[PDB]
Amino acid sequence: DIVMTQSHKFMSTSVGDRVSITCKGSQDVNSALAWYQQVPGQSPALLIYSGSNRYSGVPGRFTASGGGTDFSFTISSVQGEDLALYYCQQHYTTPWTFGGGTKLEIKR
């Protein structure tokens, strides 16, 4: 089973700042990787498809890169509604698996 590791369960940031979350599949999953955002009491929302592609309606501050075994999710200028959970997922080989998630939180 491929393993996705999101080392930072939490990441401090500020509004107007820039952040980067990282993911590391145990194996090379090439480009078959997705990023999701989840807010409490809500279902995950697809943000990035194929390692670096935005999904539809997904804002420009959301970017993502990677293509191999290490992937990075990025937010150019963080807004108050981005202080949620971001999940990593590999869809290269079954069983499909997700990272443990990274929750962005405001530094104070």
Partner: protein
């Protein structure tokens, strides 16, 4: 307006299985495979398996070999996931998920989730 509407909260006792539903609308049901995901506090988001409404295929996560039965009913535009002999290890939120493209197994469409709580 693609959409997946899931059924209500479930209070279930040990032993005893429960079958959950997912009514899909806005797209031809048979054209896409339905997937199921589990989400628990600790242990995280875990993919359960899929089913094709075109022929009834069932590919499942080894981890859920016996615990889950994915059946789909056309004319219903509805999908179901029957869960097995519920222990507390099964208490969580279950999601209904579908793809957006057909060149990306990324889940672009999700149901709102069905909360299952196993208590006696």
């Amino acid at each position: 307006a693609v959409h997946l509407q899931q059924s209500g909260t479930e209070l279930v006792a040990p032993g005893g299985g429960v079958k959950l539903s997912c009514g899909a609308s806005g797209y031809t049901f048979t054209n896409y495979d339905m997937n199921w995901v589990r989400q628990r506090p600790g242990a995280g988001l875990e993919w359960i398996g899929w089913i094709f409404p075109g022929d009834g295929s069932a590919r499942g996560n080894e981890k859920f070999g016996g615990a889950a039965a994915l059946a789909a009913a056309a004319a219903g535009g509805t999908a179901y996931m029957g869960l097995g002999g519920l222990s507390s290890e099964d208490s969580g939120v279950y999601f209904c998920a579908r793809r957006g493209f057909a060149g990306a197994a990324s889940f672009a469409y999700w149901g709102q989730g069905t909360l299952v709580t196993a208590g006696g």
